[PDB]
């Protein structure tokens, strides 16, 4: 056995909250069609894309000091 009090769950049990006068004039409920939060996500992704493109370009352009040596040395030994 066991004992407790009880409250009937009737459909008439309602609740009455209080709203502030300036509650609904919030900058969050009222959102424009385009916000800057998304622009942050796009711009960060573009910056990160440019970061990896920089390394790709660096590994591409690292051959510039290399390509010049082997085009001049076999002609230098040819003249000498």
């Amino acid at each position: 056995w066991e004992h407790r009090r009880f409250i009937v769950a009737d459909s008439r049990n309602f609740i009455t909250p209080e709203f502030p006068r300036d509650f609904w004039m919030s900058p969050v409920f009222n959102l424009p069609r385009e916000t800057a939060a998304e622009q942050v996500v796009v711009l960060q992704a573009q910056r990160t894309a440019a970061a990896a493109a920089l390394e790709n370009a660096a590994m591409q352009a690292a051959e510039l000091p290399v390509d010049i040596e082997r085009r001049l040395r076999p002609i230098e030994r040819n003249v000498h």
Partner: protein
């Protein structure tokens, strides 16, 4: 006759091909660094 006229042929063949070897380096080294410039512009175009 055949001695001095054939001796200069070695230098003729050397010079007329050293004239073209520098041209090949002129062309081959310009179409490669342009790729570097295009890649740099592409990287900026990512931004």
């Amino acid at each position: 006759q055949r001695t001095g006229r054939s001796a200069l042929a070695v230098l003729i063949r050397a010079c007329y091909r050293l004239q073209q070897q520098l041209q090949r380096t002129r062309r081959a080294l310009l179409h490669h660094s342009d790729a570097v410039l295009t890649s740099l512009h592409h990287v900026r175009m990512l931004l």
